[PDB]
Design a protein around this nucleic acid. Sequence first.
DNA 1: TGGAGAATCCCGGTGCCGAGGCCGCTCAATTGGTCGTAGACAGCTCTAGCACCGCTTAAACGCACGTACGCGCTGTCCCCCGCGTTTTAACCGCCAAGGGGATTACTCCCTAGTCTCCAGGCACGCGTCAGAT
DNA 2: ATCTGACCGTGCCTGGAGACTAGGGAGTAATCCCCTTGGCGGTTAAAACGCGGGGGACAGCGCGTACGTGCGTTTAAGCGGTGCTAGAGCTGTCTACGACCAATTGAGCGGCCTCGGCACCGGGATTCTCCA
Lengths: 97, 94, 92, 91, 200, 81, 80, 107, 104
Amino acid sequence: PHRYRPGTVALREIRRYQKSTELLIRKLPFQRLVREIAQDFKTDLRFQSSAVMALQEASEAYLVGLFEDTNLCAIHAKRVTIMPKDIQLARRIRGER
Amino acid sequence: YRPGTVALREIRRYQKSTELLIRKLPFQRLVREIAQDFKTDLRFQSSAVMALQEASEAYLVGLFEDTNLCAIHAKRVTIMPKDIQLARRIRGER
Amino acid sequence: RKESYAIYVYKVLKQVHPDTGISSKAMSIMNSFVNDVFERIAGEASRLAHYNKRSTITSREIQTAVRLLLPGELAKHAVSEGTKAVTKYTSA
Amino acid sequence: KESYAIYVYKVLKQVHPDTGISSKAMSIMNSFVNDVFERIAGEASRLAHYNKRSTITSREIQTAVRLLLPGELAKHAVSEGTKAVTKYTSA
Amino acid sequence: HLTRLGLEFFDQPAVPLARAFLGQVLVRRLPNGTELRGRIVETEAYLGPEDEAAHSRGGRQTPRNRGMFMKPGTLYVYIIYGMYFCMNISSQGDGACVLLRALEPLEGLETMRQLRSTVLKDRELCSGPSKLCQALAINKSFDQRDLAQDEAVWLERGPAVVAAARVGVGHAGEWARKPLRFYVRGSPWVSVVDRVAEQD
Amino acid sequence: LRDNIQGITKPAIRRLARRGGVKRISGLIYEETRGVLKVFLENVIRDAVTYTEHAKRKTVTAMDVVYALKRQGRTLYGFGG
Amino acid sequence: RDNIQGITKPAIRRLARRGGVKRISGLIYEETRGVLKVFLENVIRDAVTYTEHAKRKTVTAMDVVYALKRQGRTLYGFGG
Amino acid sequence: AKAKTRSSRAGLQFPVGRVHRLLRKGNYAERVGAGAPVYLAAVLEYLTAEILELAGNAARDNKKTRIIPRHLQLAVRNDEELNKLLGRVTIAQGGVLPNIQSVLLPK
Amino acid sequence: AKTRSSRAGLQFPVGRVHRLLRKGNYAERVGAGAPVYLAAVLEYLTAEILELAGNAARDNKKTRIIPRHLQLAVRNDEELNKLLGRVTIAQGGVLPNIQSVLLP
DNA sequence: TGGAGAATCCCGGTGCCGAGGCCGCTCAATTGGTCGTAGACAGCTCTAGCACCGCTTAAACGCACGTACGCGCTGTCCCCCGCGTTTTAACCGCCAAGGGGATTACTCCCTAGTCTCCAGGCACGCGTCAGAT
DNA sequence: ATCTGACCGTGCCTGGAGACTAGGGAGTAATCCCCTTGGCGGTTAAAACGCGGGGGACAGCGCGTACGTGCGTTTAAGCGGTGCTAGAGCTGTCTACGACCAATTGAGCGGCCTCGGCACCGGGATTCTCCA
């Protein structure tokens, strides 16, 4: 069979996802996560569907920006893979703690 | 002394200090030189130049803190221009 | 009745690109952009009027707010367009 | 000009009676009070415009304090403000 | 003369001498040849280290305040953070003294009216210690001198008492609000009055 | 409602990372990323619920989330404005 | 007229030693002079805009405080 | 006595009157002048035209006729002045620009 | 003639806060409990800052607080460092914090 | 170097549902006129900014030397990527329903506005006391 | 042992507080309809798991050199003092610009209908990647 070398599928996934605009997290686990976090603040709430979509777009954009900064942190250490150290350093420079 | 011994003494001295580590009159001349390109025949209050000095000192000290953590992240104890560029890009200025 | 900058953005779009339409979500994006730029410029003009002890927002306050917010070439072109509009409004 | 100097001095003398404040630290406290005032009043103004209400009452100030301050500080600030408003209304 | 008090009466503690310090006529013979004949209406007392507002709190041994423990009843004119003066006589103990606050003269109004102006109503002309210190010709040269020498300032015995809280000290401490200052009741020429303390 | 943070799967974080230009991913990214997401949402919707508590409503609207994002310097276009 | 060189090399070393830095490479100095020039250019341009609107010719400290508040770098202690 | 719109007097397409009403009932100042809505309408019209021209060019580059939010994201993030005006915003359904660092591409 | 600062048990001016709310163009109308609430919140915040600053000056054996003590008070407490995060203090310095890899 | 195999591109045809124009009507922008005060304009005061002058003196500077440190190379092994297979459950479609947001009517109490006045609060003075060095 | 930046009296002044009126913005309740939670079920796409193996993370070693440290010269900041005047800051005066009101009228918004741009499908040409 055909056996792609490690990296090529990762690059083609980078092309495919950066070309598209569709939201990557499944909508129903994100909806349950939003409702589970909202259960800790006010019990028996309800959400508009546009509110959960707004939270999903914000969370996806934030995670993509954090993964960009994490990637440049990992390239700064002369590596290719990303570590939790890179996420921690990126969040400390951005101020989020 | 051995290298790195006097440096840690300078760090412990200057972090306990309060006063402005950048020199007042060359900074004032640089402020005049920058503001010359915007409006001709400007004037500056002394409190304005001291305010700019305090803001610039705090900004550079925070930038060098982030530069130091970028340098420690790369298994180094020496900071380099790539560390300044990385910290400034993650902040969002570049 | 919900007010929005829909037909005005249609008119500017047909003026700069006569054979190009637009979608509903892009109306949402451009309407939010116009509202955010309006809030930013108006809040800066409010701060400018409060700083120099004035009670009136004039074209000078919006001019200095546009100079404060927008980056260089965009700010210069915005000031040129605004002063052209104000001179045309006063003269006619 | 008008400053919060004497009131900050009274707050100092209540919390630490054998303690003084320099001139620059008093200026820093004046700037801090004005900055927190502007933040809370701006959030109350935004919450007045969002709910289409033309009055800033204690409810908007309470939720502006709850938005603008971190957790334990926000809880204690809400408690102190509620105590002051209830004592002022009772009197 | 005969109406001059001696050391047998001035050697007293703070509170029992201050209770017997109402209506006394403090007379300074300024060298023009006239006298003021002014009667006191209110005084202040400092018992010692118990009061936090005293200048000798907690056994202070400053080189300026040194003549009070040598002998009781010591003359003491002293500035208040600048050029305004105040009038004080000490007592036996540490930190115990009594300060003179407000006077009412009966004659010589024009001389102190001219000397005050270094618009001129007599109600606010001497309603305070710094006003009478600029009316009785009080300077800094009355510190190392007693009360029974030559022809200088002395006391004369002239012809209800309400204890009032301190005014102008702020709401701080635990000893700045105790009513100990004695002032007359019903007089309409008192600078510091207490309407709530009139009912006892 | 319990243990719904595991619903954000490992391929979901991989999709978000290759959207961000990441070529290789360590195994300890995912849990760490999940924690980051929780610290985001507990900071956002805590504001939005607060906004819902001020209008005396029981429904968290989209415009409330837009206000909560604008309070944090994370302004969102396309969901009202 | 080159007053950016007046920000000396030991001044940059002092600012880094307050920042916790132990070793400094020789190319740090030109980069941080450029950094100070960019930051000071931004704050001075906004302050000069405030002075233009105030119809003054002297830049006050209040204009600098407003300029730094605009960037999100609020300074306490200068009347702010 | 024919009624002429203030936007028609100023040669503008954005509403002078609506901008004036919003400046009044937005609590910005106690008084709002006559030239301020004209100036702000001209500024908003210029910024709308500046985004829409680049978004139309981006939509023409993708062989499409109408502008979607992805084209607006490309137009904003491919112009430096518009990017630094809008540096803290999320264009919904916008995506990200295609960029990979050179150390990840194969040799 | 009782002032509203003493009517609510507050050390900050309720009237001045009310005047700055009216003249600040925040809204068309202002409430009566809103200046009292805002003055109480400001008084609590300055009490917490002054308490931590006086503690920081007492640990340094100084009886008068300077801006260094204010900086230590704000950036040694997590909540005030979160609130005053984007704010620099004139003559405040930085915290004594040395990274672990630099020490031998 | 060719070459097999997978992936992306690209042509034409289908169909759908959403953009785009038409139209009636509400309601908000515009036209005149008043009237009131905010703000432009002139003028004067005096604060503070600027330029310049010697001195001494702390800091910047250039040079010499050496050792810690960056950086390249190299070996190992571990962890992650790719891929196939199996299990899981998102998701689309449809429906019930009931809680909740929106709206309207009607008060009604709280806050704007104004007169009068009086008590806090800002400006002032400098020896010296603790306070800092 | 020695330098040094804040501490209760006084004139006055001016903004806050009590008192009264008005009117309109917010509270309260009944009613209505979108719309959001919950459930059932089939289908199929996506996640989960196991396994092999390539390749990158990481630790170690050696070497060149480049910064740290120290010392002697040098230079120009720092402090103090003098002179000069531009321009901040305030005040008086008058008038032009905007708030406000009422009548009028057209334009923008909701409803609604229609057709064409775009997503999708499918086979074939093109290119990329891995490999002996």
